[PDB]
Structures are given as structure tokens and as C-alpha cells.
Amino acid sequence: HMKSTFKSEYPFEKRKAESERIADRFPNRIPVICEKAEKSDIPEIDKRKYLVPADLTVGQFVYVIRKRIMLPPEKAIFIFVNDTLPPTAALMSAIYQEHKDKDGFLYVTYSGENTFG
Amino acid sequence: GPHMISGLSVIKQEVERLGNDVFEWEDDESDEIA
């Protein structure tokens, strides 16, 4: 199966164009994209689109992920950005400011495994 | 991914579900994503 969904629907230029407006819509927001690693064994999300605020932290985002897949408390889920595991106080705001891309939108990834690769 | 070829002119894109205001569901802002 594919990998990207909400970001696969359209090309990049589409996203960049989106963030170009989201900047005039919600400046006090943090556009990100939750994704599930392939190696992972957990259930992949339905779509990759998460508009977290500039207040929500990293340890606060996961929760949102644990909501979609409604993963039980008997499972685990770790975030990964560029193959790096950010802290909890790593305000998603300061995260999307260091993990931003040409498109502007963030690209996070969660996996039941806290491994690298 | 998809890219342009040659010449200059409008562009055409596809879609599966989204497309409308790059959002067509509960609510992107929905706390569901935060």
C-alpha cells in the first residue's frame, strides 16, 4: 500500500500553497502531519493531517495519535522526527519551527517501536 | 511525485476526498487533532 494520504492526494506545491493561506488563517497554529512508520507493527492512521496549536507539546500530541488508532494502554507509541525523538516540553511550536520544510507543514511520525530505522 | 513538463499554462491536479479548502471533514481545527 501507499504511505502518504492527505499529503498524497495533492502535490507539494499544493501544501506549500495551503500553508501560504493557513498563515493568514491561523498564525497561532502549528500545522503538522502525523504518519506511521512502515517498520512499525501498529495500525496506520486513516490520514496524515494534524493541526496542533502552538501550546500543545510533544507528549501532548502523541495522545492525539493514541486517539485515532485508539491504541490501548497496553501498547506503546513513540514519536519520530527526522529519526529523532523529541522531548515532552518540546512545545510543538518550537518543533514546527525547527522541523519546518519548504512546504511549511510539519511531518511527524509515530511508531510503536522506539527504535531507529 | 507529479511535476510539470514544458511550456507555461494552467495546472491540473487530482483528488481522492480532499480538495475543498484543503479540508472536508469534522474540522481541521478540531481538537481531535490536538
UniProtKB/Swiss-Prot annotation, chain A:
Pfam families: ATG8. It comes from the Eukaryota. Gene3D superfamilies: Phosphatidylinositol 3-kinase Catalytic Subunit, Chain A, domain 1. This Gly-117 forms then a thioester bond with the 'Cys-507' of ATG7 (E1-like activating enzyme) before being transferred to the 'Cys-234' of ATG3 (the specific E2 conjugating enzyme), in order to be finally amidated with phosphatidylethanolamine. This lipid modification anchors ATG8 to membranes and can be reversed by ATG4, releasing soluble ATG8. A lipid is attached at residue 117 (Phosphatidylethanolamine amidated glycine). It is a lipid-anchor; Peripheral membrane protein. Changing residue 29 to D: Impairs ATG19-binding and autophagic activity. The keyword Nucleotide-binding does not apply. Belongs to the ATG8 family. This is Autophagy-related protein 8. It comes from Saccharomyces cerevisiae (strain ATCC 204508 / S288c) (Baker's yeast). The gene is ATG8.
Curated annotation (Swiss-Prot), chain B:
Residues 5-34 are annotated as: Homodimerization. It comes from the Eukaryota. It is found in: Cytoplasm; Preautophagosomal structure. E1-like activating enzyme involved in the 2 ubiquitin-like systems required for cytoplasm to vacuole transport (Cvt) and autophagy. Activates ATG12 for its conjugation with ATG5 and ATG8 for its conjugation with phosphatidylethanolamine. Both systems are needed for the ATG8 association to Cvt vesicles and autophagosomes membranes. Autophagy is essential for maintenance of amino acid levels and protein synthesis under nitrogen starvation. Homodimer; homodimerization is required for ATP-binding. Also interacts with ATG3. The C-terminal 40 residues are required for homodimerization, as well as the interactions with ATG3, ATG8 and ATG12; and the C-terminal 17 residues are required for the ATG8 lipidation. Belongs to the ATG7 family. This is Ubiquitin-like modifier-activating enzyme ATG7. The lineage of its organism: Eukaryota, Fungi, Dikarya, Ascomycota, Saccharomycotina. The chain holds residues 601 to 630 of 630 of the full protein.
